[PDB]
Amino acid sequence: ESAWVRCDDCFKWRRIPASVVGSIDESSRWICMNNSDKRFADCSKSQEMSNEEINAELGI
């Protein structure tokens, strides 16, 4: 499935594989450029969908 990570530089939420999210804990610095998905891999790129749409996809 997908998980979502917040960029520590611009605070947009980025879709990442759920098989990797466990390695990103709250001490870790993660930014857009670290994203392997190059549709959404610098801080200028708009967020993929709204926060409420993300939470709906996650069922939270």
Partner: peptide, 7 residues
């Protein structure tokens, strides 16, 4: 970093 995932 903050993350969100399915519960």
């Amino acid at each position: 970093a903050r993350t969100k995932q399915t519960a």
